[PDB]
Design a protein around this ligand. Sequence first.
Ligand SMILES: C#Cc1cn([C@@H]2O[C@H](CO)[C@@H](O)[C@H]2O)c2ncnc(N)c12
Ligand SMILES: C#Cc1cn([C@@H]2O[C@H](CO)[C@@H](O)[C@H]2O)c2ncnc(N)c12
Ligand SMILES: C#Cc1cn([C@@H]2O[C@H](CO)[C@@H](O)[C@H]2O)c2ncnc(N)c12
Ligand SMILES: [Mg+2]
Ligand SMILES: [Mg+2]
Ligand SMILES: [Mg+2]
Ligand SMILES: [Mg+2]
Lengths: 339, 326
Amino acid sequence: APQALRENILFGMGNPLLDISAVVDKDFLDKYSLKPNDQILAEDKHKELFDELVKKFKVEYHAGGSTQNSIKVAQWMIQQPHKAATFFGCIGIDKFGEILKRKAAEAHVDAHYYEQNEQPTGTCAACITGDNRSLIANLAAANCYKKEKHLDLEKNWMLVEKARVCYIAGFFLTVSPESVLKVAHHASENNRIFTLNLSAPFISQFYKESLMKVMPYVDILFGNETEAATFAREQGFETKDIKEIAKKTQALPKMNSKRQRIVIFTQGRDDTIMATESEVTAFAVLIDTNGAGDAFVGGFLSQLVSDKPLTECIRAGHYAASIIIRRTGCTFPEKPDFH
Amino acid sequence: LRENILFGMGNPLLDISAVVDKDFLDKYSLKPNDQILAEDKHKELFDELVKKFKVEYHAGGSTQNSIKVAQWMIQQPHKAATFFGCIGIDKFGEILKRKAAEAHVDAHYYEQNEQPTGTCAACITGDNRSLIANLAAANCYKKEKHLDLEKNWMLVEKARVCYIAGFFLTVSPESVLKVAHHASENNRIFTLNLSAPFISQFYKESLMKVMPYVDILFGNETEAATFAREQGFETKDIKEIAKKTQALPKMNSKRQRIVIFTQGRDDTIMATESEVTAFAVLDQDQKIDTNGAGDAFVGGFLSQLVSDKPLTECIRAGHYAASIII
Ligand SMILES: C#Cc1cn([C@@H]2O[C@H](CO)[C@@H](O)[C@H]2O)c2ncnc(N)c12
Ligand SMILES: C#Cc1cn([C@@H]2O[C@H](CO)[C@@H](O)[C@H]2O)c2ncnc(N)c12
Ligand SMILES: C#Cc1cn([C@@H]2O[C@H](CO)[C@@H](O)[C@H]2O)c2ncnc(N)c12
Ligand SMILES: [Mg+2]
Ligand SMILES: [Mg+2]
Ligand SMILES: [Mg+2]
Ligand SMILES: [Mg+2]
């Protein structure tokens, strides 16, 4: 028989961040030795950057966090019911905290946060030049999430049990790999679909212990082309061809053998590459590329909760990425127009 | 070393060896130097060997050999090493049980009656050995009938080092992946052997499923060459194949993979994270069962690795165990 949506069908958890964006200049990038299109975790030498950004530029504020973006876009495309998509994560008790709570509610997402006083809500600097964005994430509160404090409490765990599809960005592996593995194991032992993002090169470089521990449980791996290339370089694939990286990544040991792994790499304007059990194939597309990537996954997830074909999941991803790309931030004044 | 510190599973075989002649090789279209699984065209071969040649009988199976040599070099305690596998309830079965116990190995076999205990025919001509395995009972091993039962699975949990020959990938890749993944989860060392060229040629989907879990890969030079060819490595140099094999996807990043290729009386090649280095074989005999020497090398190596001795002392112990068995 045919599957059909209902509340808490999609589960996501990750770092809830408030994004602080501003058009900067090449000098500001060098002052902090930042590259134009990069995504890094805030080091201690970057502490000055967050004050200087707000002080010296005209900044904007938008709700962010990669998984959180994908879960809002998934909920939008799903449309009905409200709260089809669940989000968990940790924030501070502060102004930025409350903006985030409000934005998940306006997105009709069933958000359940772990809140605490010690750390302010996490923020992410987006320093823009041309069509480049240089992201620096200051996780703060987001880095305080603990399974025992939140995910394990039975009120919250119940909602993960409702889920048919789980999505967690690789980014969250820097904070609570124990939480990611508990959802991962659960998905495996109850034949639910578990899905992950490579998220950023630094995850494959510096967080591969958590990444490769979870990979055997990953039903669908998403990512973009530099992430794939960093992953291939780091895991000794001895190739640069995206299609060959998708194929070797697809064939990695897998726990739940009742589902073959699917691997999807988006490529900006280049074609989106999908590796299944039996082939690797390109799909052409038809500027926040980072956000477009998150929206692609939200589009894809939006159809995967219904068990639609993989082609239709890809086409929905491409559709959500083109829409959200034009409107900055996570609001949706229009309704999806996808058939 | 406590009891059950080293875990092994594989195909328990009784080896039936004899010096044969060229006619026998030709009759069964055998490679003078090879290791194959018995196909239908080989059914008659095992009877004809026993009947027409002067055969000898020894307890065998690659992993089983390595585990016995490991227990011997470890010495204490008795039952430092565990072995799982499947046999028949028959004469050859009982010889194997007896030999493991005399070896002080904690062998927990799955015994059943539909298939006889597996045998391996070693057909010698000159310095050539042509091995043909009739796995039989060995091939009946099933995780659900044995490995999964909690009294056996408990013994795998005791293990700090696991060793499985790639041979066992033809039989139960499900069992190998369960031990493999378990070692990874609990940062226990998981080790595997390339075992023979036919593993890479015909079971590479299973081989490459498990390779990410392999903390130490062992093998000889032809296995390394077959592996590089089948993996499209391009290079044929043993030191280079060791290096690219070392750098392959790895699921437990707490341990950098080590790759050891033996090469007969040539040097043993070892590739770690940061270098590849040759270690010579000092003590030379004339005349040799390289296959059995290879198994013994791994037993020697494992014997020191359960104590967390340096890699150089593991290798020296391997070279030492090989020269004894020769
Ligand atoms: C760096 C970085 C990050 C950027 N992002 C998100 O990338 C989104 C654009 O796709 C931004 O909204 C930012 O919050 C992260 N989300 C969770 N954890 C992270 N470490 C990051
Ligand atoms: C062929 C072969 C095999 C040879 N051997 C063993 O290799 C030892 C020589 O090192 C012999 O004792 C043979 O039984 C195998 N053991 C497990 N599975 C196998 N398929 C084989
Ligand atoms: C052939 C052979 C030899 C193998 N070995 C040992 O057995 C291992 C398995 O091939 C070799 O790496 C070596 O340690 C020898 N040791 C001393 N003299 C030898 N001729 C050999
Ligand atoms: Mg996230
Ligand atoms: Mg992205
Ligand atoms: Mg074996
Ligand atoms: Mg060998």
